[PDB]
Amino acid sequence: FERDISTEIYQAGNKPCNGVAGFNCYFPLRSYSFRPTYGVGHQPYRVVVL
Amino acid sequence: YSVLYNLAPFFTFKCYGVSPTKLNDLCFTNVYADSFVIRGDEVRQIAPGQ
């Protein structure tokens, strides 16, 4: 039950990029494709917890 | 699986489905080694079909 939102690039493979976002530095936030038609396993779902 | 990371001045790779982190800890039965030559623009075609 903890929330953290941050997009700063980190030293994934040492040699900290500090915003360089070069080689060995991969972005933390990845997006979703969510094709209009696709397999049920890769189709968006909506979930709510009470 | 940790080849030299000064391998070349320009290098591209994208692992989908397998996290490069702690790649030594996770392991499989057999691994194949392959060699290819594809032009600079066409290397994007190495993917699940596309």
State CA A26 to chain mean position distance: 10
Torsion of CA B20, B22, B23, B28, to 10 degrees: -130
Q: Is B43 helix (H, G, I), strand (E, B) or coil?
A: helix
Structural tokens at position A19: 């915003």
Query: Which method was it determined by?
Result: cryo-EM
Query: In this complex, how many residue pairs, one in chain A and one in chain B, have their CB atoms less than 8 Å apart?
Result: 5
Structural tokens at position B23: 């790649």
CB B43 within 8 A of CB B12: yes
For residue B5, the chain A residues in CB contact (below 8 A) are: 13, 23-24
CA quadruple A35, A36, A40, A46: dihedral sign: positive
Instruction: Quote the CA–CA distance of B4 and B19 in Å, as a whole number.
Output: 18
**Residues of B engaging A, defined by a Cβ cutoff of 8 Å:** 5, 11, 20
Give every CB contact of residue A26 below 8 A, 6+ residues apart in sequence: A12, B20
Suggest the residue from A10, A23, A27 to mutate for an interface test with chain B (most B CBs closer than 10 A). Answer: A23
For residue A15, the chain B residues in CB contact (below 8 A) are: none
